[model samples]
Target: YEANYEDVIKKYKPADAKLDRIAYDWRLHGGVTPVKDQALCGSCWAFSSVGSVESQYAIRKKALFLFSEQELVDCSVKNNGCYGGYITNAFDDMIDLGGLCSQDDYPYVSNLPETCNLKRCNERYTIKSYVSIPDDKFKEALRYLGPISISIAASDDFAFYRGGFYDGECGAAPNHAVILVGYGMKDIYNEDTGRMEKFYYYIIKNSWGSDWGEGGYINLETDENGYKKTCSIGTEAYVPLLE
Candidate 1:
């Protein structure tokens, strides 16, 4: 069953809806740094998970690491090829296999090459700590964590998206992936056009083309119905710290 934009918004409304201050920062955490475009590859799943890990590494390690989604796609034994996958499974694959390879170690074969080259792959980072949340508690989890891996509905409509705020249909299912860095409301002002619009949402970074949706980043807000469609993973996928 396909879900329309409106249908999704209405189905996930929160019961205690209130207008709260939307926080902004000089550096809003997990944006897909050095914007990239995946041109027609149904690899949103790879981008989403890798993008989250990349951002988390930056925030936690204070260093930037360019991980490869292709590595995860080609190497992850559990991930569904090209179709998509759950973040939970991706994390598990990373842990079980030691870790994923870097971009330079395993370059992406855009055409969905014959098969994955596991020999060239390398596992660098370890899953330190992770958690997963039910759809209803997604917002709460985002508020508590520095960065998170999340699932959202994506549509072909977003295929052509290029910069600025977007609130259009992309695709459906748990297909789309992204990282949630922060949440807040803002009144965006365009100096050239002198137009102002108010947006209340979470700051989400994408790995699609950097040209799309605020430089490979977007703000996902609840609609008039006070609902936003999202699922959380990662908190449960991390390697726990001993007490």
Candidate 2:
């Protein structure tokens, strides 16, 4: 499905919501990982899912592997364009499509202008090797596993997020994606203002250039509604996985 950019941009805004942090671990999953920028592609849905699968594969297999999100993007039949997608759909696609491709099979191009490179593709992993748990089981799953595909409202500030809580307006349609490799708590203060803060945070691996947010990563705290809206599947139609 194709996305209408104008319609999607209408829902963008910043949120001040907050929630308690759950305990977990974060790690740099995969080897020689590449930094990606969605830049108006609305393909974050694809990236987040692929990133989670890639990390999970590495942790479970104990091998460095870069899964191809482009494969999911170009082939996943359920995605409604790049506007946005739910975590469940991507997982289900992997399950039904046999598996996903790797970066070598399908590399990503910045911006939405360039068409998908379907000709250059390679399928290296299968869904049977991975597992997708229900939203309620996420905490337990993380405790037993390494990484998973989680979603969140991407702050419009995401375009300028350079290592902070991203206290800014959110973009439309959650137009961003990242991998949740672990979780934990931390105490930090902005030296510029001498203000201190403490919270439990998710260790997220972002596609934005490494120069942004704690070396291209950010600590996202669960919000008032819980990270459920951001992390759970099925709430949105484009999302994959019924169970």
Candidate 3:
């Protein structure tokens, strides 16, 4: 759970120095999978965990495959499934289950099952381990590891966020999970001020379906008029490790 900035930059920093300062989106780079809905269930943890592993598997294997979130939702004994869970617990469960089956093998039902029913599948992906990213170096980790699973406070205010930079009145407690796909600056038009202002934002992939924020994504300001780290984005960040 501890990785110094020095080690992170030393090992994973991009050859292009401009990358360190400019915006990057894994979605555009094909490292991110299409957004999926968690439905009425609180299985955001499963979606976040599966998404991170899926992207890592794609980036490393050079093939994109949608793994089963239902596999983790039903089979992860330690997790609460539809009720709630943590990304780390889901990762641990994946390791214990010897990896995950394809989404086609076990499609999401949007509801918790009575018992773990992991049917035999032709293909499975595995992760050796997972790593915790230091809060100061999340952008660096995202650059090196592709997409990362992170926790955030899913408050009432945050629930209604539809677009633009999110600087809402979200709580401090981290309650929900999502994937950090990209980060960068964008110029936003300010009507009151009658000018365009540039702001830094983190591109978050949510499990709320395409009808939600900007096509199942939300732009959380990395810095908003002096405030920073909206919805505790940098906290509880983890990425699956594949070797």
* RMSD after Cα superposition, model 3: 2.9
Per-residue lDDT over 82-106 for candidate 1, one digit per residue giving the tens place of the 0 to 100 score: 7667676777666676666787887
Q: Give Cα-based local distance difference scores for all models.
A: 0.57, 0.55, 0.82
lDDT of 2 by residue, 1-243 (tens): 223222322222123322223455645334224456665566777777777666656655667667776666667778854656656677777777766777776676534444444556545576543344454444444544445565556655666767755456544554345676655656678798798865555556777567878776776665322244333221232212111
TM-score of each: 0.69, 0.66, 0.88
In candidate 3, stretches whose alpha carbon ends up further than 4 angstroms from where it belongs are: 1-11, 14-18, 112-114, 188-197, 224-227
* Candidates arranged by TM-score, highest first: 3, 1, 2
Taking all chains together, the TM-score of candidate 3 against the true structure is 0.88
lDDT tens string, model 3, 1-243?
A: 324445545655666654454578898787888899999898999999999988998788888889999888888988888999988889889988988999998888988565577655677788877788777766767777778899988788867878877766887699999999988887889999999998888899999998898899998877532126777775788888775
Q: Which candidate comes out best when scored by lDDT?
A: 3
Model 2 scores worst on lDDT over the 10 consecutive residues at 234-243
Candidates, ranked, lDDT:
3, 1, 2
